Amino acid sequence: PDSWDKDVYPEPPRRTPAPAPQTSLPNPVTYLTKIFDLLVDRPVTLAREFIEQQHAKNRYYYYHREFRRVPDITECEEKDILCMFEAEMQWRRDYKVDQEIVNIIQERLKACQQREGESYRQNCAKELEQFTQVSKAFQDRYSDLGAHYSARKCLAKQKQRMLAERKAAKEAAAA
């Protein structure tokens, strides 16, 4: 339905064929579907309608909490404990958000594989490359930090990678 955003969780237009009977024999699945409808789907719908009627009389709201952007660990001096603490909290929040992003991409990949059936190897290449890109980024950001991780160790890993890349680029410039 409209509860979740259709851009974060997209799906194809859901093309379905029309029934084209070829025999005079009656279809038992259609009769069973009608029986199931009349015996299950209508009482459930009525119960849900009553439940929604009761819910409408009591409407209240809950809000999504917004967090300001505080300075990160790069702009904290060596022994400033308060700035370090706030930067570490922000970094942990960002780590959780990145984990959830990877989770969303993985959900997309799983949905594509189930939906495409026998042609998943061809019709899920875009989801696969999206997951490859996000996985590489997440690995570069957070892998091998180990337990007792921190924003300082992430910064050290990033700086080591930057130094290696800069040395490689400089040595390629002389080639």
Partner: protein
Amino acid sequence: MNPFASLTLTTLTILTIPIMMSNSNIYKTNLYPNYVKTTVSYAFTLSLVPLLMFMHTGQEMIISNWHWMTLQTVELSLSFKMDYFSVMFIPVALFVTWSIMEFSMWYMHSDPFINRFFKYLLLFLITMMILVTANNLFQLFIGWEGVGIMSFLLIGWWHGRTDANTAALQAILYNRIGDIGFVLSMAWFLTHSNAWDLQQIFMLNNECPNMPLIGLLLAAAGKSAQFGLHPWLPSAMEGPTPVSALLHSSTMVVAGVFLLIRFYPLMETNKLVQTMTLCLGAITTLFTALCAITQNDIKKIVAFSTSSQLGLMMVTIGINQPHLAFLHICMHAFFKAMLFMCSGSIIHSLNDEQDIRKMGGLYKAMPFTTTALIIGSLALTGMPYLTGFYSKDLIIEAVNMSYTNAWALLMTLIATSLTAAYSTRIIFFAFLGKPRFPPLVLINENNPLLINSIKRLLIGSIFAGFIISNNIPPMTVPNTTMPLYMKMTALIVTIMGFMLALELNNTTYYLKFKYPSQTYKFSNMLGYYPSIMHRLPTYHNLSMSQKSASSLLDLIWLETILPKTTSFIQMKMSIMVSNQKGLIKLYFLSFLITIMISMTLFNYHE
């Protein structure tokens, strides 16, 4: 909403209602087994409908209804896979369980704990359904261990019997040997694919390496009782006959084959693992068929038949024919359950006797049982247009027309001979000839429960092959062009087995006696595998566990090094320090020595 998901989940849900009522009053009455049987029958007739929906439109679904926990990037959810395999296997298992519980209502009538027996059967059914419908590896492991533990509890039903406890522990040991490989596969998949669910694993493993597939193969060999870990299935016959008919014949022992079928997209991308599976299946089926033809206990013969059929499922997996293997599972369930049911009726009629040497002429004394067993034996041997034809003969045809190991093909053919061989042995020794049982005849098969259940499985064993084969889409490319002699290979092999086994069985009427050959001794004693492997490794392991780990290290050397050395050293030093004679002469001499040292070794150093 689409009724498919609701019906598939309701079929699984309603099976747990008697488990919830197990604490209610109905569990204390004698109406509980009938209640459980009726619940299972209702579950079967409900599961029939999603099968019709799939047979019409090929509807498949996955339901991630409940989120359990999320570890970082990995999400664990209660998810059910409702593809062709689930929607086809659920009704067959429910049908077989319904028949077997109706049989148990008669077979286990005098058991004082019949309610507990039916509850255990229902728990096993629930765990097998969980195993079959699982979409991720954690849920499948839950079903794995649930059916394993239920098998342990049902094998040792008569817990006052030492051999039952021994067999249950043996089954647990072998299943955990396979579980080692299961856990290895799980760890590899989580570490390299970041998922336990089937969909992610398929997407991220285009070229599957050897480690996860070898782990899965080890798990399947453990669960399906292949040659390395075979002996526990024949020893599982310690349990009551319904347990052997349901768990260790047709439903639980196919779990390894089903696990390998669940991962066939990864299996078809690796040829080494396929070759290993094919070779293991071939050696298993031929070894078990060779062991079967010399056994005198009917349940042992049928259990070895089950093991040989499992080996056949492994070989048809090895030639990259997973759908054919699933079809074989579904087909074999019917007549193998029927064969155990007939054996149990025979056993109950002849005062709990299982040796075929004391089973005389029951062809006339037990007409319905004889007819059912003959039909089941013809289905097992691949008689055309029966249940066993549509799968076994296609399996032989596909094995013949594939780039396959020659030895595996030859061993499959010899096992096909031996199948008819031991079927002829069973029929000849159990139903023909003169009576050999004690004179007081208690033969009576005039009970509606037994007749109705065996009748239902007989109708299944007659028509299910045709109906199911004609009511599914083509998932395998047919072999249309083959040489005529090679088309008839299975039938020639079966007829040769029939003729030669019948000849050797007819020769025992002669008044001539000869000592057994060494090959007969090898076949009858199961190749001496339980004689050596159950005695040498166990003795060595327990002997090292006591002599070395317990006594040599913990009780002797770890004691010697840290605590006993400390105690000895402190005692010696205390004795040295405190044993003074109390004479001031010696003390003041030592005082002079100390003064001389302090003034020289210390007072000169500043």
